[PDB]
Amino acid sequence: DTSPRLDCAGRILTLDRPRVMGIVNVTPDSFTHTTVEAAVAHGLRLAEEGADLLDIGGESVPVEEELRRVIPVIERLVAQTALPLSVDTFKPEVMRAAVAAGAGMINDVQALRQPGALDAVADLRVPVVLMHMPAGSAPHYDDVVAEVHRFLVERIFAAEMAGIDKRRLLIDPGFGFGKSTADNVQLLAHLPRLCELGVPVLAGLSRKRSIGELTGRELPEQRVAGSVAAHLLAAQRGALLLRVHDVAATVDALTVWQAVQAVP
Amino acid sequence: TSPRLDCAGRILTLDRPRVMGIVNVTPDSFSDGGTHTTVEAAVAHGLRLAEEGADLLDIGGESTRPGATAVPVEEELRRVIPVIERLVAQTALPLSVDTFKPEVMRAAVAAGAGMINDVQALRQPGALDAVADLRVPVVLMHMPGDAPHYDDVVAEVHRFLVERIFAAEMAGIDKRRLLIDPGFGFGKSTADNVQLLAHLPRLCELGVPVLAGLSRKRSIGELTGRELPEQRVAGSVAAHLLAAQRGALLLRVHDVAATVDALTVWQAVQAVP
Amino acid sequence: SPRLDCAGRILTLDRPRVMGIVNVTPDSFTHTTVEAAVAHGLRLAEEGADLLDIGGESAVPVEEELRRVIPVIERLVAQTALPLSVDTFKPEVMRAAVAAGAGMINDVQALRQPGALDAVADLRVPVVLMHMPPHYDDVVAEVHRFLVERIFAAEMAGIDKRRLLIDPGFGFGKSTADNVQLLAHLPRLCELGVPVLAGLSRKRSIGELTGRELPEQRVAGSVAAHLLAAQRGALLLRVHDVAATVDALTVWQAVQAVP
Amino acid sequence: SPRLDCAGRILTLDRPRVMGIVNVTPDSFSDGGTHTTVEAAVAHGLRLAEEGADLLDIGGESTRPGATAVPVEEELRRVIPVIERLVAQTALPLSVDTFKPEVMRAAVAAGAGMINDVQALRQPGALDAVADLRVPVVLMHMPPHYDDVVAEVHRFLVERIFAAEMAGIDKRRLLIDPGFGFGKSTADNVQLLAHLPRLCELGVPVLAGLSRKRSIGELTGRELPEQRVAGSVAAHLLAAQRGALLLRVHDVAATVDALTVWQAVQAVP
Ligand SMILES: Nc1ccc(C(=O)O)cc1
Ligand SMILES: Nc1ccc(C(=O)O)cc1
Ligand SMILES: Nc1ccc(C(=O)O)cc1
Ligand SMILES: Nc1ccc(C(=O)O)cc1
Ligand SMILES: Nc1ccc(C(=O)O)cc1
Numbered sequence A: 001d002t003s004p005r006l007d008c009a010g011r012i013l014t015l016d017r018p019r020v021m022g023i024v025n026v027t028p029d030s031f032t033h034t035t036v037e038a039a040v041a042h043g044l045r046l047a048e049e050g051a052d053l054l055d056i057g058g059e060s061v062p063v064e065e066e067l068r069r070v071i072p073v074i075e076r077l078v079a080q081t082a083l084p085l086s087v088d089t090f091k092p093e094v095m096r097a098a099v100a101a102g103a104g105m106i107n108d109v110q111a112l113r114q115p116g117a118l119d120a121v122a123d124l125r126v127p128v129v130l131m132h133m134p135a136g137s138a139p140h141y142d143d144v145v146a147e148v149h150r151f152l153v154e155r156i157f158a159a160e161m162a163g164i165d166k167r168r169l170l171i172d173p174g175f176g177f178g179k180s181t182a183d184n185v186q187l188l189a190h191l192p193r194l195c196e197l198g199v200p201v202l203a204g205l206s207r208k209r210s211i212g213e214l215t216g217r218e219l220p221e222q223r224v225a226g227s228v229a230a231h232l233l234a235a236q237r238g239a240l241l242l243r244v245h246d247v248a249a250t251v252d253a254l255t256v257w258q259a260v261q262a263v264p
Numbered sequence B: 001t002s003p004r005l006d007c008a009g010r011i012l013t014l015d016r017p018r019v020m021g022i023v024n025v026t027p028d029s030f031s032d033g034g035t036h037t038t039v040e041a042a043v044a045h046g047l048r049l050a051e052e053g054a055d056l057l058d059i060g061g062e063s064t065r066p067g068a069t070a071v072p073v074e075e076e077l078r079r080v081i082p083v084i085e086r087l088v089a090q091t092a093l094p095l096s097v098d099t100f101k102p103e104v105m106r107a108a109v110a111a112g113a114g115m116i117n118d119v120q121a122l123r124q125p126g127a128l129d130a131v132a133d134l135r136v137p138v139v140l141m142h143m144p145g146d147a148p149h150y151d152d153v154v155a156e157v158h159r160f161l162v163e164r165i166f167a168a169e170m171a172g173i174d175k176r177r178l179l180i181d182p183g184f185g186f187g188k189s190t191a192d193n194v195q196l197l198a199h200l201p202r203l204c205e206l207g208v209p210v211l212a213g214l215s216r217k218r219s220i221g222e223l224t225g226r227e228l229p230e231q232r233v234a235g236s237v238a239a240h241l242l243a244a245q246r247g248a249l250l251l252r253v254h255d256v257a258a259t260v261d262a263l264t265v266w267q268a269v270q271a272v273p
Numbered sequence C: 001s002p003r004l005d006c007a008g009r010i011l012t013l014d015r016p017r018v019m020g021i022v023n024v025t026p027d028s029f030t031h032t033t034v035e036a037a038v039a040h041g042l043r044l045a046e047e048g049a050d051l052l053d054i055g056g057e058s059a060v061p062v063e064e065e066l067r068r069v070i071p072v073i074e075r076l077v078a079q080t081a082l083p084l085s086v087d088t089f090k091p092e093v094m095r096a097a098v099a100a101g102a103g104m105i106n107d108v109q110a111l112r113q114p115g116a117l118d119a120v121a122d123l124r125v126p127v128v129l130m131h132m133p134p135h136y137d138d139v140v141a142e143v144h145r146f147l148v149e150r151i152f153a154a155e156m157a158g159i160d161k162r163r164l165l166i167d168p169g170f171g172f173g174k175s176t177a178d179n180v181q182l183l184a185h186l187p188r189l190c191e192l193g194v195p196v197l198a199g200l201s202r203k204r205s206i207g208e209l210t211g212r213e214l215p216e217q218r219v220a221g222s223v224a225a226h227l228l229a230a231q232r233g234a235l236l237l238r239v240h241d242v243a244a245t246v247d248a249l250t251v252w253q254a255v256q257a258v259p
Numbered sequence D: 001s002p003r004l005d006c007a008g009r010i011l012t013l014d015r016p017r018v019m020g021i022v023n024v025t026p027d028s029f030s031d032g033g034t035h036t037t038v039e040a041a042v043a044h045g046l047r048l049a050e051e052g053a054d055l056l057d058i059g060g061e062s063t064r065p066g067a068t069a070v071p072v073e074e075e076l077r078r079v080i081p082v083i084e085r086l087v088a089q090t091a092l093p094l095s096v097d098t099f100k101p102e103v104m105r106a107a108v109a110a111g112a113g114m115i116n117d118v119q120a121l122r123q124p125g126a127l128d129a130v131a132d133l134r135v136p137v138v139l140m141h142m143p144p145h146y147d148d149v150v151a152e153v154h155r156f157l158v159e160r161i162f163a164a165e166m167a168g169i170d171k172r173r174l175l176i177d178p179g180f181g182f183g184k185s186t187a188d189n190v191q192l193l194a195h196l197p198r199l200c201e202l203g204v205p206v207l208a209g210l211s212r213k214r215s216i217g218e219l220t221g222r223e224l225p226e227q228r229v230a231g232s233v234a235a236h237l238l239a240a241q242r243g244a245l246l247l248r249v250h251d252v253a254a255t256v257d258a259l260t261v262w263q264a265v266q267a268v269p
């Protein structure tokens, strides 16, 4: 009826069409002052490439170590871009410190299952992404689509009962290593069924192993074409946020699709 | 049940969209001519496109881009024939020749080509007789020329292609050897190109395979804001995936590996009940 | 600097000028040969050629040579403003080509064909005298001697010295080593009071120096040879690769213009 | 003839040598949909080695007009994997194009044998790094209007030779580069090439780099960099004729062919 309007601490994200969330990782890789400077420059590049929002993450660690990584990046990007900023964390104290520093959204891989996380997000009144998460083999699911659906309903309801408004919830089926290639494809094929839980859906298949397995592409930067295709397919199947590394390419694909879809 | 195209003995099965790699044989397509021949650069490029997973290669020696100078037949032959001769010996792929000249169609097929991609839809005198004699598949493209305004571009392209299918059948060309192409970019504005892509299912209902070619075209540049053709890859791959979703069975592309990857992810998703 | 009046089309040799090669000879792929040659000549004009050299022999009888070169000359004289040269050693072809619009004659035989001296004297167009003879004791001295003899014979036939050019004849009449000798010693041939034409385009000797077997693989080495020839005094360069040669000469002219 | 010890790989400057340009930037390649930036750069370096390059120059930060600065962690993530792969797969000497001391040390540990510095060691720690590292180093000139561009570039290049001098930077490791394209107009670039023998009279090998540069485009009317090859090869041959012993180029095979013809002619008494 009404397109979702997300107030990310004053920076508005309108989901009248799929929006692109650019990935900004702040994790030392032995190549952290130099890590912070590189993360900020990367966020500015993704903003130039047309990102609708940036997702800043400092994990792959104690709260104080996560804060030393993400807080300087948030403070600099809040000052140097106009984009909504999301922070990737499952720890409530990081959620509170990040929002105080300027973050406007929380992307939580644990779907607020960390003790205190429900109360933090209810207090902070920012949007939150609830992800499904259950290396070696992925777990076996009898019906991955039904299981992810059941889990996300439970987490949506727990968040509402903790006082988090439904209009601030997003869900993410958790494409990636908690699923086999076949289960990731099932979740993508049946994504419209998860879009009917009354909340916007985020899809993040960027450079993931399943894309590599489908296309025979061993390294993450070789998986760009397949990832852009997966994200276009997810948007066609109802996803409203796409979490990507390759921002300019994804924006281009979505723009061509939007022009075609606009024809009656 | 799926169309099987016999391209001079090399079989192309259109049970899913197939990727036609563009092999341009023009001195201007390459910057290494200081120490390379035009033929050898085109052959090396075709071999790379075969390695990237092309299902067929389209070899052309005459540019039909806006503002091109016509290439005389003797020069067109000097470009395409040596490239076909080398690629037929070095690939197992069906090979198409992109030409509107019957003399080149006949010489190219004698050299090993198994398909003709004709931007003039066999309107050059002798082209119908050649294709009927040669018994290879042929792509009939729409173009007004050789930037007009249309009252209804989708209906006008449809009407033209119906007429050319009919002309080809009445010349003795088997209907099972026919393919059609709406001719994205040829005498069409960005808006007309988007209209033709959106309404592409309407052209797939003529019972013949449809080829779509939007690779790095000016319209993709306008839609995405990418001024240089090499910057248009992502937008081109998206356009070709959309065309395949709308019924196109052949995709004529420069960026073969990327297009193959996109189609492969889509095929995996489509294969889920 | 030499001012060459090519049948009304003036070529000023204050710096090296580029002569684009327009071959009209049938190959593995008549009317279609003429159409391709005209198109090629127009392309070389667009690429910056200062003049075009039209040739219908690479044995071809006069009547056959005329069927090749005359239609090409007639079409190019109408569609370009460039001076046009005809590459022939046969006096009857020289006369017909000039009547059709040619403004210069490039003669591999240096007017040694019976009748050639009187034809060119009658026509009042410029002529390039090439050396064609193989082993030499002193190739540079032998070429010099031959070209002096031919310049003098042309003057004694009534061809004004201001219409003469010479060409050492790089190419198959010399070994790679002898071609390199003539290039190194080219300034010595520039002291005969007449402009020198150098033509090393895609020749076997460049290919042998660089290990490039096919003619289009020899382009970089050919452009380099022509820049060296221009540095050593050549005022006309006969080339296939017009745009590339024009580019190299343009960069050299910018550098040479600095005191 | 000068012999450069690039970490065991000897570069003998008995004739002009060709330095092939290996840029490690996502913008330098179009096949990124299915290739990594590193793998495309390594493949390119191997192609330039096959075309006859005498050394490869690996760079991960573009200093062209208006480029955004590249963070050290990102510069390292680009150049180090390319150096590591090329040291294993070619026997050619490898140079790193960087002005950052941290990248110089990491690059040499990964296998680089030479450093090409556009800021002529004006970066704090670079002089100390170069003096510490003791690999050959190219000292380039970079600053716009000049009163006399050749003398001013000459003066600056003298001061940097003097500034470099007496840190343990042996004068036998110094190379200079007048820096075509960096803060110089077409006219100023033509001036420096014409008068290049005057900079060759300092006793250190000289590197010339005009490959596909904007000045070449302006002189020849070639708008796209890939259309500038012929003019670039001519410029590098003029530079070799005027004393340059290193030529930094994109078009290796063409430059090698031009040098091969000139060497055959120059060899005639
Ligand atoms: N100047 C640059 C800044 C950032 C990046 C990057 O994040 O990849 C690359 C270059
Ligand atoms: N494509 C070309 C490359 C190089 C040259 C040249 O060296 O003059 C010319 C053309
Ligand atoms: N040796 C090669 C040269 C060129 C190509 C290509 O054009 O893709 C591939 C291989
Ligand atoms: N052959 C063609 C090539 C390109 C275009 C275009 O860019 O619109 C159209 C036709
Ligand atoms: N359109 C043309 C392109 C090329 C040529 C040529 O190579 O002579 C002629 C015409």
Ligand SMILES: Nc1ccc(C(=O)O)cc1
Binding pocket: A224, A225, A226, A228, A229, A249, A253, B233, B234, B235, B237, B238, B258, B259, B262, D030, D031, D032, D033, D034
């Ligand atoms: N460089 C690129 C090439 C291809 C794609 C894509 O297919 O989306 C994206 C980027």
Ligand SMILES: Nc1ccc(C(=O)O)cc1
Binding pocket: D040, D043, D044, D047
């Ligand atoms: N195999 C090759 C890979 C890459 C290149 C190149 O980038 O020039 C050339 C050859």
Ligand SMILES: Nc1ccc(C(=O)O)cc1
Binding pocket: D062, D063, D064, D065, D180, D181, D182, D212, D213, D214, D215
């Ligand atoms: N690093 C540089 C690259 C290019 C140019 C130029 O084109 O002038 C200058 C410097």
